[PDB]
Amino acid sequence: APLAATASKFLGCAYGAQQAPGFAQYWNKLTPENGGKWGSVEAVRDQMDWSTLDAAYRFAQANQMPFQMHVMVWGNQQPEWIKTLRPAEQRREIEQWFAAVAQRYPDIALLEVVNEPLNDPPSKADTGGGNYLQALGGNGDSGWEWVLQSFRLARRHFPHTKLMINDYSITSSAQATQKYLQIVRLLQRENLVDAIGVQEHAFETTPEVAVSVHRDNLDALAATGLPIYITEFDLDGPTDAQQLADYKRVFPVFWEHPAVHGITLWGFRPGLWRDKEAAYLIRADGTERPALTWLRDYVAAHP
Ligand SMILES: [Ca+2]
């Protein structure tokens, strides 16, 4: 049985080939790690490779776990062919991408419309950069026109789907939280956003900023009345002990927050994004690390 089986909020994980073994025995919600990024689906213009995204969606439905679509608009892993197209043609391609996802996947629990607006807008012309910011109106009058246009498109094409914004390095500072909330404020003028996501990777939760500051900033995000999701949680494990200590220090602050409606770990087996930093909770030999032993007991004790 998954760790959060009897909890009031989900505990999910990034799903993909290396995260697949025993997945449903641990987690009760998923996000496709890479297959839902536009560059993964439409690497070649007007031919859609849905295989990896289908795999994640099929698995989620078969195990009756909520599916978070990751991700519609982002500044990495976007198609290469779109970069040099005129803004009018880029926009038509974006709209087609939105309509295609909406048609194929009607049971999306949370649609991540824009990821990393404060950190990685689709304004670069490098590998996977997209370079389509101006197709969505660029900064515009508010400074975040492109975000507004992305969520407007999401509302139009996904009329019954919960819409989420996602970003990193938010709760680590009041200034970043206030910046992020300006975007949320602009979105709420047209009631365009339903959920607030913060990634909370290991680099976001280091101890030089106290967890109480993270909690205060969670309160600030919660003041919007919108549900909060922790979307891409990981903690490094150069030693088992450091990982265990960090899990004890950091995880409860997010898990116990009343506005947090779910946490998704960004992988749990080797091959996850922060493999080099040993953020995995299960070793190469299949054995559970002390942080995971603790996590199961902690989650069971906190429904
Ligand atoms: Ca197309």
Side-chain angles (χ1 to χ4, degrees):
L3 278 64
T6 61
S8 59
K9 59 190 80 183
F10 61 70
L11 185 57
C13 189
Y15 179 86
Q18 283 72 59
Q19 306 307 317
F23 191 98
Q25 278 69 55
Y26 292 87
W27 320 118
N28 65 353
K29 178 266 178 182
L30 74 79
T31 302
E33 192 178 7
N34 287 299
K37 294 158 184 179
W38 195 7
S40 305
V41 176
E42 200 175 359
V44 178
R45 192 190 192 174
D46 294 335
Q47 62 188 52
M48 312 297 263
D49 186 0
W50 298 111
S51 60
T52 307
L53 190 53
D54 283 345
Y57 188 79
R58 170 173 61 245
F59 180 82
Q61 283 208 322
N63 292 275
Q64 306 214 200
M65 49 182 66
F67 180 90
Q68 176 182 325
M69 177 59 186
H70 176 79
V71 48
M72 302 311 291
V73 173
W74 188 39
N76 272 286
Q77 292 173 263
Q78 303 301 288
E80 279 288 275
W81 51 263
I82 199 168
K83 295 190 297 188
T84 56
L85 297 176
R86 285 182 68 72
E89 297 300 348
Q90 293 181 319
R91 184 170 179 79
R92 294 172 82 203
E93 292 288 354
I94 296 162
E95 182 137 34
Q96 179 167 60
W97 160 237
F98 275 60
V101 173
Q103 179 189 39
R104 198 172 181 89
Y105 309 105
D107 301 320
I108 293 165
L110 293 160
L111 179 66
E112 197 176 330
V113 183
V114 178
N115 187 35
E116 298 173 9
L118 295 178
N119 286 291
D120 188 11
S123 58
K124 307 300 174 296
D126 63 352
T127 311
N131 193 39
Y132 58 75
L133 200 82
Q134 300 307 319
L136 294 162
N139 292 354
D141 294 334
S142 71
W144 301 101
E145 179 65 28
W146 68 275
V147 180
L148 300 176
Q149 290 199 19
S150 298
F151 280 84
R152 284 171 195 150
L153 282 168
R155 279 281 189 241
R156 210 175 315 161
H157 292 278
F158 301 77
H160 309 277
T161 308
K162 290 191 267 84
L163 308 183
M164 192 179 67
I165 191 167
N166 196 29
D167 216 329
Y168 68 78
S169 294
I170 303 303
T171 57
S172 52
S173 77
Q175 184 174 0
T177 292
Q178 288 146 18
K179 276 210 76 187
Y180 199 39
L181 284 186
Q182 174 55 20
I183 306 175
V184 175
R185 174 178 165 99
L186 294 168
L187 287 163
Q188 290 216 286
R189 298 187 92 254
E190 294 171 58
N191 302 305
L192 287 167
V193 67
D194 304 312
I196 301 170
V198 185
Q199 289 175 21
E200 312 293 4
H201 291 280
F203 62 83
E204 300 170 60
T205 57
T206 49
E208 87 287 352
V209 176
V211 289
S212 63
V213 175
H214 286 274
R215 192 170 57 250
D216 293 335
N217 288 322
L218 284 171
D219 289 347
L221 297 171
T224 60
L226 298 173
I228 302 171
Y229 293 92
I230 305 310
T231 56
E232 307 183 7
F233 189 93
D234 48 49
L235 288 167
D236 297 343
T239 56
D240 288 351
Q242 184 184 125
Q243 195 181 228
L244 176 61
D246 274 338
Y247 262 91
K248 289 179 178 178
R249 183 182 64 85
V250 178
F251 190 86
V253 183
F254 297 104
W255 187 254
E256 289 168 26
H257 198 283
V260 172
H261 281 66
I263 300 184
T264 299
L265 303 191
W266 206 245
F268 77 120
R269 294 195 183 273
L272 80 176
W273 189 43
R274 291 184 73 83
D275 185 90
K276 283 180 177 289
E277 295 83 9
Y280 44 80
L281 288 169
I282 300 183
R283 310 188 180 90
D285 74 346
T287 58
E288 301 195 353
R289 299 180 75 184
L292 181 55
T293 305
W294 177 86
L295 188 64
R296 186 182 284 102
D297 291 340
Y298 170 84
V299 174
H302 295 78

